[PDB]
A paper describes a structure:
The structure of [name]–[name](αP) complex was determined to an overall resolution of 4.2 Å at best using the counting mode dataset only (map 1). This structure was obtained by applying a twofold C2 symmetry during EM data processing, resulting in maximum resolution for the most homogeneous parts of the model but an averaged position for the [name] molecules, which showed a high degree of conformational heterogeneity at the periphery of the complex. As judged by the relatively high local resolution, which reflects low local flexibility and mobility, the strongest contact consists of [name]α domain D1 inserted between the N-terminal helix bundle domains of α and δ regulatory subunits of [name]. The domain is inserted between the N-terminal helix bundle domains of δ and α subunits of one set of [name] subunits rather than binding the central cleft of [name] as proposed in a previous model. The most extensive interaction surface area (844 Å2) is between the [name]α-D1 and [name]α subunits, which would explain why [name] mutants lacking an α subunit are not sensitive to [name]α phosphorylation, as the major part of the binding surface with [name]α-D1 would be lost. The density in [name]α-D1 leading to and including the phosphorylated [name] is visible, however, the arginine-rich loop following this serine seems to be only partially ordered. At this resolution, we cannot establish with complete confidence the interaction partners of [name]-P because the densities for the side chains around the residue are not absolutely clear.
For multiple rounds of initiation to occur, the GDP on [name] has to be exchanged for GTP. This reaction is catalysed by a guanine nucleotide exchange factor (GEF) [name]. Here we have determined a cryoEM structure of [name] in complex with the GDP-bound form of [name] phosphorylated at [name] on the α subunit, which sheds light on the molecular interactions between the two molecules and provides a basis for understanding the regulation of translation by [name]α phosphorylation. The structure consists of two [name] molecules bound to opposite sides of the [name] hetero-decamer.
Author numbering:
A (entry chain C): 10 to 108, 113 to 128, 147 to 376
B (entry chain B), C (entry chain A): 4 to 305
C-alpha cells in the first residue's frame, strides 16, 4: 500500500521518512516517540469502521517504515507492540460477538489447537501506556541494578553514548555507601565527543574518572571488576547492537579475562527480530573523519563502522524496567510483548 | 492390524513422508478402526502398540517423541467438553492434516533459514536432516553463493550418501574426514548440523561424531548450527556426556581374538551440551537457548 | 649406485630398523664407495642425492630430518683436525653403529617409559609409532595392568592394522571411531600419541586426526602423550594450523561430478601447537617442551 491515500490528511509520514534518511532524527528513544505520535495521528484522523482491513494496513505502513530505515529498530518495535495490544483485544472481542478458554498459562503452540465497541479507545490508551513506559525506565532499572556492584570495584565502560546508562550510574554514585572507579574507552572515530561529555558529567558529580584509549583496554583487564554496555538494540538470541565503536573487542577482552559483562536496556529497545548476519544489520561510518586528502585516498581505502555488535556469549544480564534477565531467557520477555506473526511485516 | 509392519512398508518411499510423520499417520489409522468413542478401550491399546513399537526399536529416538505429541493432541481435543462425535471427526482428520503440516513447515523454514548463509560463505555440513538440506537447495534456488565441505560420518556411511546428493544439485564439494575435522576450522565460515533429537536441557541427540564438532567449534569460536522440523522433542535429560537409551553396546571391551570379528564397538549416538550450540532453527520461529524447554513445558503442562 | 632404489628394497623387512635409520644406512653406503676423503667431489653429490630423494617423496618428513643428522656427524668428524684417514674410518663405521643405536635407544625407552602407565589405567592410543608400541609390549612383559582403546585412523586404514597387532599380544581392545573420539574422554585415563615429527617450536607433525585429539584432551584435562625415537627433529616451524610441506593437495574443491571419482581430498597431515602436549618421551631423557628446541640449537649451532 502507498502513501497516496494519506497525503492531505497525514503529512507527518513523509517528514519522518525525511528525518530518517538524512539522519535529522537521532537516538532510538526519539525515533520511538515520533512513531508513537505517527500512530496517534493515524487513529485520531482516519475512518475505517472495519478492523481486519485496518490492522493489515498498519502492517504495510510498518513494513514501508522499516524499509525506509533499517537501523530504526525502535520504530519497528513500537508498531509491533501496539499491533499485539490490538490483536489481543480483537480476539477478546470476537469471543463476545460469537456468543475452556483458560487451559493453564499464556503459552504459544499456534500449530496445535485451532480457534460497535470501545476498541479504538483501548488503542488510544495503549499508545499512552507505551509513552509512559518509555518515559520511565530508569526507576525499573535502579531497583535491580544497584544491588550487584560493590565498593572498591573498577568499572570499564564502552559506549558512553547511552542516556540510559549514564543516569543509572549517577543514581548509584548518589548512594554514599557505594564507591567505584570508572574507566571509559574513547571510541575514536565516532564516540570521542560523547565520551568526553561522559567524562565531564562524571567529574561534575565527583566520581573517579579514567579516560582510556582503545588500545589500552588489554593493559587494564586484569584490574577490571565489571563491564557495562550502553546498548541501542537487543535481540532474540541475546546479542546487542550498541551505539557505536569499540565494544566487541572490549567484550572479547572481558571474556578472556573472565570479567563479568552487564547490559542496561528497555523493552521498547528490545527487538523480536533475529540477527542472522551482522553484515546486514550493522551500519558503516564515514571515512572522511579518519584521514584527510583525496589523492592519497585513491590508495587509502579506509574502513570505519558506526554500530558495533556483541554476540550473546559474553554478556550475562539485561537489566530493564521489568528486571534482570539472562540472555538464554530474553526471548520470552520479547514474546510477552510481541506476537509471532508481527515480525515479517 | 499392526503398526510396525505399516512403518516397514516405507522402504523406497521416504523423503516426503518424514520418519516420525509416517509413524504418526500409522497411529491415526490404527485409532480410526476400533472406534475412538471409548477412551478406555482405545487409549490403552494405543499405549500397548507404542510399547510394542519401542520393544522393536533398534537405534531410533524420534518415534517415541512423535507418539507423545499425538497423545497430547488427542487429549486436547475434547478439552472443551464438546460433542463426543465432532471432536472425534476432527481427531481422525488431524492425521492427514499432520502430514500436510510437514510440507507447510518446510515451506516456512526454507525461506527463513536462508538468511543465515551470507554472501560467499564456506560451510562445513555434518549429518543429514531433511530441513538442513532443504535450506541448502532452496538457497541455490535463491541464487546465492556458498561453498560446501563434506564430513565423513560413519554410521551406515553417511558422508558418501551426502556427497552424492550434493552432486545432483550443482554445488562444488570435497571429502573431509572426521579425524581431520579440526584442521578445517579456519577456512570454514560456519558449521551446520542436523539432529536426531533436541534435549529438554537444550542439548542435542545426534550421530557418531557431533559433540567433537561442537567442542572444536567452541575452541575456534566459529558458529555451530542445528536445523530441524519441530517434532523432535522428547522429555529426555541425558545427565552425563555418555548416557543414552540403547538396545546395543554402551562401550564393550572384547577378549583376545585371532580371526578378527569382534572390533567395531563404539558409541554410535553422542550427546553435546547446551553451551556449544550458537543457533537453532525450526518452523516455530527463530529460537535457540531456553526455547526448547519452554516448548516442552507448554506441551506437557508440567 | 642409487639411494631411492636401496630404500625401495625394504618391503617385507621394516620394524626395529626404522624408516629413517634405513635411509641413513643407505646414505653411508653411497658415501663409502666413491672416496669420502674429497669434500668437494663427494658432499655436492650427497646433496644432489638428497635433493633427488626429496623430489621422489610423496608423504614423508623424517627422511629429510635423518639426512641432516648424518651430515652433522660427518662434519663433526674432522673437527679435531685429525688424520684424514682415521677420521674417515670412524665416519664409515658410524653407519652400522647408527643402526645399532636404534636398538640401544629402544632398550632404554621401554624401561623408562613404562613408569607413566600406572596401576590399572585405560589408554586411548592414536598414531602408531615403533616406540609407543614397544612401551605397550614391554609393559605387558613387566606384568602390569592396562586397558586399550583403538582409534579408527584413516590414512590407509591404520586403525585395523593397529587392532590386529594388539591382538597378537594378549590385551583386550575395541574399535573407536575418530568422529566419536570426543565421547570417550572420561573413561580414558591417558591419551598416547606417536609422532611423525616434532617441531622447532615444540608442536607435532602427525597423521589424519591428531590436533583434534589434542584439543579435546585439553578440554577434558586428560593427559596427552608423545613417544618417539630421537631422530625426528627438523628445523621446521609451521606458522599456522594448516601449513605443511606437501607433494599432493592443500584442500581442493572439485567441480560437479556424476560418476563419483573426485571426492576424498582432505588434509592427511595435521599440526598441533606446543600447549596441547602434556608430556614427551625419547631416549634423550625425560623432557617435553623447550627441550626439543634446545636439542635443535645444540645441533645446528645457530
Amino acid at each position: 500500500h502507498p502513501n497516496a491515500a494519506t497525503s492531505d490528511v497525514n503529512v507527518t509520514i513523509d517528514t519522518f521518512v525525511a528525518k530518517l534518511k538524512r539522519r535529522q532524527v537521532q537516538g532510538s528513544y526519539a525515533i520511538a516517540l515520533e512513531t508513537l505520535q505517527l500512530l496517534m495521528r493515524f487513529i485520531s484522523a482516519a475512518r475505517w469502521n472495519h478492523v481486519n482491513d485496518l490492522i493489515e494496513q498498519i502492517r504495510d505502513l510498518g513494513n514501508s517504515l522499516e524499509k525506509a530505515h533499517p537501523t530504526a529498530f525502535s520504530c519497528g518495535n513500537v508498531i509491533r507492540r501496539i499491533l499485539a495490544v490490538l490483536r489481543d483485544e480483537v480476539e477478546e472481542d470476537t469471543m463476545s460477538t460469537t456468543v475452556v478458554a483458560e487451559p493453564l498459562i499464556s503459552s504459544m503452540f499456534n500449530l496445535l489447537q485451532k480457534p460497535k465497541t470501545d476498541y479504538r479507545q483501548v488503542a488510544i490508551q495503549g499508545i499512552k501506556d507505551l509513552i509512559d513506559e518509555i518515559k520511565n525506565i530508569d526507576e525499573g532499572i535502579q531497583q535491580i541494578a544497584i544491588d550487584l556492584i560493590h565498593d572498591h570495584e573498577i568499572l570499564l565502560t564502552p559506549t558512553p553514548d547511552s542516556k540510559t546508562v549514564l543516569k543509572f550510574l549517577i543514581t548509584a554514585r548518589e548512594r554514599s555507601n557505594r564507591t567505584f572507579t570508572v574507566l571509559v574507552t574513547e571510541g575514536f572515530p565516532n564516540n570521542t565527543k560523547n565520551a568526553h561529555e561522559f567524562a565531564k558529567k562524571l567529574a561534575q558529580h565527583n566520581i573517579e574518572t579514567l579516560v582510556v584509549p582503545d588500545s589500552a583496554v588489554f593493559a587494564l583487564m586484569s584490574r577490571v571488576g565489571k563491564v557495562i554496555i550502553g546498548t541501542k538494540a537487543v535481540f532474540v538470541n541475546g546479542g546487542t547492537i550498541s551505539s557505536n565503536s569499540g565494544v566487541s573487542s572490549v567484550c572479547e577482552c572481558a571474556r578472556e579475562f573472565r570479567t563479568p559483562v552487564f547490559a542496561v536496556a528497555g523493552l521498547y529497545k528490545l527487538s523480536p527480530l533475529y540477527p542472522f548476519d551482522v553484515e546486514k544489520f550493522v551500519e558503516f561510518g564515514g571515512s572522511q573523519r579518519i584521514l584527510p586528502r583525496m589523492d592519497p585516498r585513491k590508495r587509502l581505502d579506509t574502513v570505519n563502522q558506526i554500530t558495533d555488535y556483541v554476540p550473546p556469549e559474553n554478556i550475562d544480564i539485561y537489566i530493564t524496567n521489568v528486571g534482570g534477565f539472562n540472555p538464554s531467557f530474553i526471548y520470552r520477555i520479547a514474546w510477552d510483548n510481541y506476537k509471532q506473526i508481527d515480525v515479517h511485516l | 492390524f499392526n503398526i510396525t509392519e505399516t512403518y516397514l512398508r516405507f522402504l523406497e518411499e521416504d523423503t516426503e513422508m518424514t520418519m516420525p510423520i509416517a509413524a504418526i499417520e500409522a497411529l491415526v489409522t490404527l485409532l480410526r478402526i476400533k472406534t475412538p468413542e471409548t477412551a478406555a478401550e482405545m487409549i490403552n491399546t494405543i499405549k500397548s502398540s507404542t510399547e510394542e513399537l519401542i520393544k522393536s526399536i533398534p537405534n531410533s529416538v524420534s518415534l517415541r517423541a512423535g507418539c507423545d505429541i499425538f497423545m497430547r493432541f488427542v487429549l486436547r481435543n475434547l478439552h472443551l467438553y464438546g460433542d463426543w462425535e465432532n471432536c472425534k471427526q476432527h481427531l481422525i482428520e488431524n492425521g492427514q492434516l499432520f502430514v500436510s503440516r510437514a510440507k507447510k513447515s518446510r515451506n516456512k523454514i526454507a525461506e527463513i533459514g536462508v538468511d543465515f548463509i551470507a554472501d560467499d560463505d564456506i560451510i562445513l555440513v555434518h549429518g543429514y536432516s531433511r530441513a538442513v538440506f532443504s535450506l541448502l537447495n532452496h538457497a541455490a534456488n535463491k541464487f546465492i553463493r556458498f561453498r560446501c565441505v563434506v564430513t565423513e560420518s560413519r554410521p551406515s556411511k553417511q558422508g558418501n550418501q551426502l556427497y552424492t546428493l550434493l552432486e545432483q544439485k550443482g554445488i562444488p564439494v570435497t571429502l573431509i574426514v572426521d579425524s581431520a575435522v579440526g584442521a578445517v576450522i579456519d577456512k570454514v565460515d560456519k558449521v551446520f548440523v542436523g539432529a536426531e533429537g533436541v534435549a529438554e536441557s537444550g542439548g542435542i541427540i545426534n550421530l557418531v561424531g557431533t559433540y567433537s564438532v561442537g567442542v572444536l567449534a567452541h575452541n575456534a569460536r566459529k558458529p555451530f548450527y542445528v536445523v530441524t522440523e519441530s517434532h523432535k522433542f522428547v522429555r529426555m535429560f541425558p545427565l552425563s556426556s555418555d548416557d543414552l537409551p540403547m538396545a546395543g553396546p554402551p562401550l564393550d571391551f572384547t577378549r583376545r581374538t585371532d580371526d578378527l570379528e569382534d572390533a567395531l564397538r563404539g558409541p554410535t549416538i553422542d550427546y553435546t551440551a547446551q553451551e556449544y550450540i550458537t543457533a537453532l532453527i525450526t518452523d516455530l520461529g527463530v529460537l535457540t537457548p531456553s526455547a526448547v524447554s519452554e516448548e516442552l513445558i507448554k506441551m506437557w503442562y508440567d
